[PDB]
Structure 1
Amino acid sequence: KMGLDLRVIPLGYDVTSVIHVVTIAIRAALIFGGIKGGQLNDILKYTAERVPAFVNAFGPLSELVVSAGAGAIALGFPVLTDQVVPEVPTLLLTQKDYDKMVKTSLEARNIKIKITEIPIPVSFAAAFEGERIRKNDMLAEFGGNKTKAWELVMCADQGEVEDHKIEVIGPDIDTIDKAPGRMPLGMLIKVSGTNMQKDFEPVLERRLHYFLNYIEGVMHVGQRNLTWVRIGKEAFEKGFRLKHFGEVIYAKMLDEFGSVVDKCEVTIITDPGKAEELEGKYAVPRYKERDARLESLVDEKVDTFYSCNLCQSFAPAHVCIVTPERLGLCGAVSWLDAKATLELNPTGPCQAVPKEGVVDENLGIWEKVNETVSKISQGAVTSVTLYSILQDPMTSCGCFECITGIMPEANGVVMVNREFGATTPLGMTFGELASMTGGGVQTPGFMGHGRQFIASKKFMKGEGGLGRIVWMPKELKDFVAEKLNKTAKELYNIDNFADMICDETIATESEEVVKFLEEKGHPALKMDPIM
């Protein structure tokens, strides 16, 4: 059925009639691109980037047809044919298989078709998130203490993934005795793309938690091999099977992550043997390598930090600089998270900050960092220091959980947490410290940060290191003690550095804390004066 509304337009029986669609691309540059006539290079650049046209030349090709195809190539339109031709990669391609010509052309022109609906019987929507189904409603249960279940998103070469390939290994939920039963669940999502890299694998994986939760009748909580999934009996009635897991995952992966994901393959494994074999072969090595990469990343290896300005809605001058060792002070934005956000969401909160114009690497001063901070904060903050608390410190917004303040009598710094409602050696409570520190104002001697920055190598590197930590609430100390002791052992100190740090149980007062520190041989009493 041919028509303009049917999007099937016959131009003419002569080869020269192909110019009538060429002028469509040409006038698209003239009308929508706003390019004046005579700017041929700009028009050719426009049609190559903006007009997703391609040529399918069928049947024997005369010299005139080939020369007209060279015109299509001149406009950036790849030419596909079923004839033997002198192929040019990405420009002139031979595809004899008529069953694959459409798919070949879409790949050659980088055309993606949006799957409007997910082919599932059960309703899919965001409003169905958090609707817990009880034991009475439940049919199937995966993971937890009942059995072993795992999920993994891995990047693979395009050859190893097949587009829209949803397969199930082992029995389905239809073989269940109709009683609530236990069976292992292995979810394996292979994703391939030109812009996809390994550092983006965790991010997509997190979205899996939401993608399964938007289906009514199924709930997913947990991560990696701690997968914990429940499927209700009503899903069993409506016609929900394990293949719809793959259908939903594929649809949402191609929708949300179309920028970096070109091909997606979802595999559901139910066999006791195959699930464990694939978890051992694929899941655990990638979990270990992700943990190792998170552990081993330092500011020296990278050459690009990331600026985040998400919290400028309530702290107009606040700019967060995220390094491998300095997390976003909200505690939820990391260096890898910022890189993934910049790749997936350009013109978003996270932007690249090149490491150029190094001024003081001990203190953490770069000319490019100062330039970016001045630009993003709209000139409110001009010069910043990444690793020092007293000299041109970073600002704080108000999402932070921990506040580090300076205690000069102890020649160190105390730390307060949001959940700690009592007083500190410093006097101010967390609320007064929060009012003094947050809001995007550079306040020397005070800073806001998360729990992970405490055990960092760059924590107060400009003032000596984390040896300045002289007071900390007992819960915070118990949470951080392992990594704090590791970093202090690397610094210059016996491993049990947590015990020398005072807490609210021992003493919350100036002279008492000072006496405990000096009787305990705290390193902060043997350093240079902090101010």
Structure 2
Amino acid sequence: MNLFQTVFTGSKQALAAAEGIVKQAVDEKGRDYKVAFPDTAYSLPVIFAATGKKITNVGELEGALDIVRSLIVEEEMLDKLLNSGLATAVAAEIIEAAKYVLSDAPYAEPCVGFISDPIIRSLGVPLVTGDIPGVAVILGECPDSETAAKIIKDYQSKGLLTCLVGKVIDQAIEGKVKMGLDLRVIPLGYDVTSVIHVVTIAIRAALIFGGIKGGQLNDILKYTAERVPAFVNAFGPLSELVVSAGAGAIALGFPVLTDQVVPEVPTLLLTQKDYDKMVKTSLEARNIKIKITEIPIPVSFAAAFEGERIRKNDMLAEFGGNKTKAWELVMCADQGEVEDHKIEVIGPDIDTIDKAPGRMPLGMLIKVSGTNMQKDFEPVLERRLHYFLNYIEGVMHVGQRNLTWVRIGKEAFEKGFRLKHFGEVIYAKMLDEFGSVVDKCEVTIITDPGKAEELEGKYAVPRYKERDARLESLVDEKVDTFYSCNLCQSFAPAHVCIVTPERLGLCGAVSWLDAKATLELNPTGPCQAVPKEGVVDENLGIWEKVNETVSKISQGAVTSVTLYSILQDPMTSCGCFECITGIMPEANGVVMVNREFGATTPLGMTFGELASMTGGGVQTPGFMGHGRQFIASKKFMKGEGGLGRIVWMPKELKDFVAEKLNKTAKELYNIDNFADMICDETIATESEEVVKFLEEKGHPALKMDPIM
């Protein structure tokens, strides 16, 4: 049968029933008996919202059938279907009203029956605050008492209000669920027409909170659709009458999810036969997001857990550093190339290793499918992995791509932590964070040595090379806009990073193109655009609008910033810099120490000691925190003298930047042996010894201008 005729037929059936019971009314009690619901100032709310007229006696109830007849034009056009759906609703209020005129107490517990106005007020304010995210009008019969309780307890757990009508009330009491207003589980009645008692919840909610007047029906329907979050779940075989009632929910704005095969209408009438995932489709169909995403991992998850410090004596497993090859990757993929919620651990898990803390390789492959996802968003999704994982109690994550470093603790394993939980966090958070641009997620955590090698140079390296290639072309002068990120104000409140093409974010994981993309996904996000205007000095990089926005975002703690200078008004540093640059006056230059290097530097300090002299969002002259790729930058210390100031690095920093740095040296008319002139820890580590090394090699910094 056609869907319009299926609604019309039920609408006529609804009318026919109302004529029958209102005929019982006029015979037992005459046309002059009081008609009223308990504790309601709005008489018959559906009839009141439509026509602004109150119904008091039986003669008026009988006369209100003309309303249902006027709403029931049988023409296959969308508006006539909604009106016909309203007709079924009005006839439901009529039938229900007659129930209360033939019996003084027609409903007896466990069925609540009609809802009084004071309960509307008690229940309305948390609907405005969203403390109850939506209301779930579930009617019909589930194939199994277990499958019904499974669903109502799911809704109950989300905090939202669920209302039962039909056989499910008997299935829910069988399923051990407990009803009550404080339990947010209300049974209306066994008859189909008692759905009108949740419909009168939303309508009376408009008349009280929205302050709209009776008879402003189209303004009511706008309030019910936009404000009150309702959705109806129809289970079991669907009669023509209940399908008609479903049209009424469409009229108020409520999507109708069902398990019965039915002619679907997008965002309005849908079939979901997988009961386990029915709650998810319903919440989405009503655009309902729960305040806290569900996490299957047992260990605690919160933002406060980030930044926790795990020492060698408390760690269980360590991945990354200069010790192991560990990488993470996020790449866009086709819809058929990924299976949703597919978690795979290839290699030794944490249960296999029962010995002392050891080091495993770690390759985190994250395949994502999206309708509007594109290749320019992959670094944005990769960035959140650091913030996703560190939130988990007992695990620590730093680094960016293949230079990552992960530590898991002994507490989480004693609490039953598994590598399977890694994908469970990434799967749920990627959806919650990016619920508009992401369709499916597939996570594969690799501790296998072969597959880690068989997935680094094959999918991880080419995605990085193409990534790092798109920035190599750009120069700060070519662009007209810089970006400001404040994500790390969680522990450095006065700190703001200004990302440029030639000055990457000091974490290394945020680029100028990355910061441009984060703004496209999140306009209310951390990264914000800053136009290159009001330039006062190009050599050191001082911009008037940059000083305007830094003062605002830092809440007046910073007044002026120079981008390409570390002595005059330097940009602050947070606490996630991969390397540190420190001023050495003896060598007329600066030294650079990386996080992984643990011995002393000629400044008489270690990286942990230098890190205490730069971070915290404090304007520190002579010290800066910066990423690894910023070393070979043309604009790196351009005011002081560029890369020519470096005189001391660890050997690991040399070998990693040998290709990138030699080229920037020749670009500044420095002989290709410039990477070799820099001193390292296999030569000398004290200024007394290093100075004579710099006098032997003929370092270009020695014959430069004094830095200060």
TM-score by length of 1: 0.58
Aligned-pair distance for 1:283? 1.9
Change (3 A) 1:314 1:409: same
Q: Output one character per residue of 1:43-63: Cα deviation in whole Å (capped at 9) or x when no partner.
A: 555544544432323344444
Change (3 A) 1:313 1:230: closer
Aligned-pair distance for 1:397? 16
Q: Which piece of structure 1 moves more, 496-505 or 447-456?
A: 496-505
Q: Which piece of structure 1 moves more, 79-88 or 30-39?
A: 30-39
Cα distance in structure 2, aligned partners of 1:124 and 1:430:
30
1:114 to 291, 316, 320: 291
Aligned-pair distance for 1:187? 1.7
Change (3 A) 1:332 1:119: closer
- Conserved in 2, the CA contact under 8 Å of 1:319 and 1:373? yes
Structure with bigger gyration radius:
2
- Conserved in 2, the CA contact under 8 Å of 1:400 and 1:448? yes
Change (3 A) 1:398 1:66: closer
Q: Which piece of structure 1 moves more, 86-95 or 513-522?
A: 513-522
Aligned-pair distance for 1:65? 3.6
2:312 partner SS: coil
Match of 2:557 in 1: 380
Aligned-pair distance for 1:68? 3.6
Q: Which piece of structure 1 moves more, 453-462 or 45-54?
A: 453-462
Change (3 A) 1:32 1:241: same
- Conserved in 1, the CA contact under 8 Å of 2:631 and 2:643? yes
1:436 partner SS: coil
- Conserved in 2, the CA contact under 8 Å of 1:459 and 1:466? yes
Q: Which piece of structure 1 moves more, 315-324 or 377-386?
A: 377-386
Q: Which piece of structure 1 moves more, 512-521 or 352-361?
A: 512-521
Match of 1:462 in 2: 639
Q: Output one character per residue of 1:340-380: Cα deviation in whole Å (capped at 9) or x when no partner.
A: 55456544565568999999999999999999999999999
1:276 aligns with 2:453: yes
Cα distance in structure 2, aligned partners of 1:439 and 1:466:
25
- Conserved in 2, the CA contact under 8 Å of 1:139 and 1:178? no
Q: Output one character per residue of 1:35-81: Cα deviation in whole Å (capped at 9) or x when no partner.
A: 67676666555544544432323344444444443343344432223
Q: Which piece of structure 1 moves more, 69-78 or 356-365?
A: 356-365
Change (3 A) 1:454 1:93: same
Q: Which piece of structure 1 moves more, 365-374 or 437-446?
A: 437-446
Q: Which piece of structure 1 moves more, 464-473 or 27-36?
A: 464-473
Match of 2:130 in 1: none
Aligned-pair distance for 1:150? 1.8
Change (3 A) 1:450 1:211: closer
Aligned-pair distance for 1:107? 3.8
Match of 1:201 in 2: 378
Change (3 A) 1:243 1:40: same
Cα distance in structure 2, aligned partners of 1:436 and 1:241:
38
Change (3 A) 1:95 1:455: same
Aligned-pair distance for 1:414? 21
2:319 partner SS: strand
Matches within 5 A, 1:45-64: 46-64=223-241
Change (3 A) 1:224 1:91: same
Cα distance in structure 2, aligned partners of 1:51 and 1:347:
25
- Conserved in 1, the CA contact under 8 Å of 2:293 and 2:432? no
Change (3 A) 1:258 1:474: same
Aligned-pair distance for 1:112? 3.9
Q: Which piece of structure 1 moves more, 168-177 or 470-479?
A: 470-479
Cα distance in structure 2, aligned partners of 1:232 and 1:507:
36
Change (3 A) 1:326 1:66: farther
Cα distance in structure 2, aligned partners of 1:134 and 1:508:
26
Cα distance in structure 2, aligned partners of 1:6 and 1:86:
35
Q: Output one character per residue of 1:369-417: Cα deviation in whole Å (capped at 9) or x when no partner.
A: 9999999999999999999999999999999999999999999999999
What percent identity do the matched residue pairs reach? 100
Q: Output one character per residue of 1:173-219: Cα deviation in whole Å (capped at 9) or x when no partner.
A: 22225144343222223445667554443344334334444545443
Match of 2:587 in 1: 410
Match of 2:142 in 1: none
1:265 to 434, 442, 446: 442
Cα distance in structure 1, aligned partners of 2:551 and 2:396:
45
Q: Which piece of structure 1 moves more, 28-37 or 357-366?
A: 357-366
- Conserved in 2, the CA contact under 8 Å of 1:57 and 1:81? yes
Change (3 A) 1:276 1:10: same
Q: Please list every run of 5 or more consecutive structure 1 residues that lacks an aligned counterpart in the other structure.
A: none
Q: Which piece of structure 1 moves more, 254-263 or 273-282?
A: 254-263
Change (3 A) 1:70 1:193: farther
**Structure with the higher fraction of residues in helix conformation:** 2
Aligned-pair distance for 1:151? 1.7
2:455 partner SS: helix
Cα distance in structure 1, aligned partners of 2:352 and 2:486:
52
2:252 to 59, 65, 75: 75
Change (3 A) 1:257 1:90: closer
Q: Which piece of structure 1 moves more, 457-466 or 155-164?
A: 457-466
Change (3 A) 1:79 1:331: same
Q: Which piece of structure 1 moves more, 272-281 or 392-401?
A: 392-401
Q: Which piece of structure 1 moves more, 513-522 or 228-237?
A: 513-522
Cα distance in structure 2, aligned partners of 1:146 and 1:383:
41
Q: Output one character per residue of 1:18-39: Cα deviation in whole Å (capped at 9) or x when no partner.
A: 3433343445555556667676
- Conserved in 1, the CA contact under 8 Å of 2:379 and 2:514? no
Aligned-pair distance for 1:156? 3.9
Cα distance in structure 2, aligned partners of 1:367 and 1:221:
34
Aligned-pair distance for 1:266? 3.2
Cα distance in structure 2, aligned partners of 1:64 and 1:284:
61
2:210 partner SS: coil
Alignment coverage as a number of residue pairs: 531
Match of 1:234 in 2: 411
Change (3 A) 1:164 1:40: farther
Change (3 A) 1:516 1:33: farther
Aligned-pair distance for 1:297? 5.7
Change (3 A) 1:437 1:274: closer
1:100 partner SS: helix
Change (3 A) 1:68 1:184: same
Q: Which piece of structure 1 moves more, 379-388 or 485-494?
A: 379-388
TM-score by length of 2: 0.47
- Conserved in 2, the CA contact under 8 Å of 1:219 and 1:231? yes
1:513 aligns with 2:690: yes
Aligned-pair distance for 1:168? 1.9
Cα distance in structure 2, aligned partners of 1:449 and 1:232:
28
Q: Which piece of structure 1 moves more, 490-499 or 297-306?
A: 490-499
2:193 partner SS: helix
- Conserved in 2, the CA contact under 8 Å of 1:397 and 1:439? yes
Match of 2:355 in 1: 178
Cα distance in structure 2, aligned partners of 1:475 and 1:147:
14
Match of 2:463 in 1: 286
Change (3 A) 1:433 1:190: closer
Cα distance in structure 1, aligned partners of 2:567 and 2:415:
63
1:21 aligns with 2:207: no
Aligned-pair distance for 1:106? 3.5
Q: Output one character per residue of 1:104-130: Cα deviation in whole Å (capped at 9) or x when no partner.
A: 333433444455674445455556555
2:503 to 326, 329, 332: 326
Q: Which piece of structure 1 moves more, 229-238 or 349-358?
A: 349-358
Change (3 A) 1:142 1:26: same
Change (3 A) 1:366 1:67: farther
Q: Output one character per residue of 1:254-307: Cα deviation in whole Å (capped at 9) or x when no partner.
A: 565567656544332222223332334432232223223333567999998767
- Conserved in 2, the CA contact under 8 Å of 1:488 and 1:497? yes
- Conserved in 1, the CA contact under 8 Å of 2:380 and 2:518? no
1:336 to 513, 536, 539: 513
1:150 partner SS: strand
- Conserved in 1, the CA contact under 8 Å of 2:319 and 2:361? yes
Q: Which piece of structure 1 moves more, 252-261 or 284-293?
A: 252-261
Q: Please list every run of 5 or more consecutive structure 2 residues that lacks an aligned counterpart in the other structure.
A: 1-177
Q: Which piece of structure 1 moves more, 447-456 or 220-229?
A: 447-456
2:529 partner SS: strand
- Conserved in 1, the CA contact under 8 Å of 2:589 and 2:646? yes
Aligned-pair distance for 1:224? 1.9
Q: Output one character per residue of 1:312-345: Cα deviation in whole Å (capped at 9) or x when no partner.
A: 9999999999776787899997544544554565
Q: Output one character per residue of 1:121-176: Cα deviation in whole Å (capped at 9) or x when no partner.
A: 54555565555555554443323444322222334456555555433223322222
- Conserved in 2, the CA contact under 8 Å of 1:114 and 1:255? no
1:189 partner SS: strand
